[PDB]
Write an enzyme that holds these catalytic residues in place. Structure first.
Site, PDB file in Angstrom:
ATOM      1  N   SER A  90     -16.707 -11.117   4.882  1.00 24.75           N
ATOM      2  CA  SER A  90     -15.831 -10.118   4.783  1.00 24.75           C
ATOM      3  C   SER A  90     -17.740  -8.732   5.644  1.00 24.75           C
ATOM      4  O   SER A  90     -18.479  -8.890   5.870  1.00 24.75           O
ATOM      5  CB  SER A  90     -15.906  -9.342   3.517  1.00 24.75           C
ATOM      6  OG  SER A  90     -16.779  -8.806   2.922  1.00 24.75           O
ATOM      7  N   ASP A 106     -10.445  -0.014   5.316  1.00 21.78           N
ATOM      8  CA  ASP A 106     -11.682  -1.049   4.732  1.00 21.78           C
ATOM      9  C   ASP A 106     -12.580  -0.991   6.116  1.00 21.78           C
ATOM     10  O   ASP A 106     -12.654  -2.031   6.861  1.00 21.78           O
ATOM     11  CB  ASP A 106     -11.281  -2.556   4.232  1.00 21.78           C
ATOM     12  CG  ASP A 106     -12.373  -2.944   3.472  1.00 21.78           C
ATOM     13  OD1 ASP A 106     -13.124  -2.314   3.058  1.00 21.78           O
ATOM     14  OD2 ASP A 106     -12.268  -3.882   3.428  1.00 21.78           O
ATOM     15  N   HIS A 138     -15.147  -2.562   1.235  1.00 23.74           N
ATOM     16  CA  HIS A 138     -15.370  -3.083  -0.064  1.00 23.74           C
ATOM     17  C   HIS A 138     -16.956  -3.468  -0.354  1.00 23.74           C
ATOM     18  O   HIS A 138     -16.953  -4.435  -1.298  1.00 23.74           O
ATOM     19  CB  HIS A 138     -14.915  -3.608   0.145  1.00 23.74           C
ATOM     20  CG  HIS A 138     -14.408  -4.816   0.573  1.00 23.74           C
ATOM     21  ND1 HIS A 138     -13.703  -5.505   1.625  1.00 23.74           N
ATOM     22  CD2 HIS A 138     -14.797  -6.071  -0.061  1.00 23.74           C
ATOM     23  CE1 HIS A 138     -13.802  -7.053   1.936  1.00 23.74           C
ATOM     24  NE2 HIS A 138     -14.597  -7.193   1.089  1.00 23.74           N
ATOM     25  N   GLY A 168     -17.224 -14.250   2.314  1.00 24.29           N
ATOM     26  CA  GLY A 168     -18.707 -13.942   2.510  1.00 24.29           C
ATOM     27  C   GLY A 168     -18.642 -13.562   3.839  1.00 24.29           C
ATOM     28  O   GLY A 168     -19.636 -13.341   4.603  1.00 24.29           O
TER      29      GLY A 168
END
Length: 231
Positions: free
Chosen positions: A184, A88, A40, A182
């Site tokens: 991720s 993800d 993502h 921030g």
């Protein structure tokens, strides 16, 4: 990271800082030429030429002595990604890393082998220190969160069916510390009793440090075939 503490790269030497120049997401070095992160983070700008990866960096907008700069030779996103983000996970071939006291690789877990619920693990990132903040911290941060069973996280008051078996939830018993915007792509590291292991990858969550809304992570031990077939 909400709460937690500041740290330098020495305490998480596999942490990779990814930029596009502005910061994008975190990642983890799993081999000299490979960094693993979250899809993502790149879906909006799939072009590999638009990314810069740093290893051995503890500061957001300032260089860290000894850091290494890399280009993305190959940006691999998971074909079954969907958006709660599913599958993800992403791989970035960098161009490779040279081990030092500020640059090291992190071991991958064994097939479907994760720590028991309640186990304390660590997360690392340059994400917001408060949900209401506009700026990201200039210094790297880390904190500790405890693993939550799928049974508890799948509860309606938590995330219901939004969470799948390929995901892992983790949170503070007081909900006072957590990952945030921030963070991720960053690492969720646990000790498989004897070895630091990349158990998860920061993926999603409803808000930050909120009651009954744990941080959700991509369950790495469920993606070993994909990782191996692409590395």
């Amino acid at each position: 990271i909400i709460g937690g503490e500041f740290t330098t790269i020495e305490n998480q030497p596999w942490f990779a800082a990814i930029y596009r120049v502005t910061y994008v997401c975190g990642g983890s070095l799993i081999s000299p030429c490979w960094v693993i992160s979250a899809t993502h983070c790149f879906i909006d700008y799939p072009k590999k030429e638009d990314y810069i990866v740093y290893l051995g960096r503890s500061r957001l907008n300032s260089n860290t002595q000894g850091e290494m700069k890399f280009e993305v030779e190959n940006l691999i996103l998971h074909k079954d990604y969907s958006a709660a983000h599913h599958n993800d996970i992403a791989l970035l071939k960098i161009r490779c890393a040279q081990p030092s006291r500020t640059i090291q690789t992190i071991a991958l877990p064994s097939m479907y082998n994760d720590p028991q619920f309640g186990t304390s693990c660590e997360i690392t990132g340059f994400g917001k220190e408060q949900s209401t903040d506009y700026l990201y911290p200039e210094q790297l941060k880390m904190t500790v969160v405890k693993l939550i069973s799928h049974r508890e996280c799948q509860q309606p008051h938590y995330y219901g069916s939004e969470v799948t078996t390929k995901m892992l939830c983790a949170a503070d018993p007081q909900w006072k510390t957590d990952s945030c915007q921030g963070d991720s792509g960053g690492p969720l590291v646990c000790s498989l009793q004897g070895r630091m292991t990349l158990t998860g990858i920061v993926s999603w969550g409803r808000g930050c440090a909120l009651k009954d809304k744990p941080g959700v992570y991509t369950r790495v031990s469920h993606f070993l075939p994909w990782i191996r077939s692409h590395t």
